Amino acid sequence: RNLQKQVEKVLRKSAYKIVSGEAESVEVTPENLQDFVGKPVFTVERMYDV
Amino acid sequence: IVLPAENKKDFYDLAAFITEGLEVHFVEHYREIFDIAFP
Numbered sequence: 018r019n020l021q022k023q024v025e026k027v028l029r030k031s032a033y034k035i036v037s038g039e040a041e042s043v044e045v046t047p048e049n050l051q052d053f054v055g056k057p058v059f060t061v062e063r064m065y066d067v
Numbered sequence: 068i069v070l071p072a073e074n075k076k077d078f079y080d081l082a083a084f085i086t087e088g089l090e091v092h093f094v095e096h097y098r099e100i101f102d103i104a105f106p
Contacts, residue, residue, distance in 0.1 A: 055076075055080065056076040056079065056080070057076065058076070060073070061073060065095075
């Protein structure tokens with residue numbers, strides 16, 4: 018579910034950058050991702066190596 | 068202020084005028100903060 022919301026957000030902030038934005042073709046790439054979602058909400062995988 | 072390092076991203080998203088002034092630290096194992104509070 019949460020993945021649904023975030024993919025939706027990406028598409029939405031992309032469309033705003035088309036209706037007036039210079040770009041007519043958004044293409045998210047891992048380097049570019051920050052611009053649409055900001056900094057990561059998680060970084061750790063497990064709370065630590067035992 | 069000092070805050071857990073695992074929350075740091077939210078401290079680097081608030082509006083800049085709020086953030087001006089105060090220094091911040093970040094940590095994960097408490098043994099670091101204990102070496103901050105008592106220099």
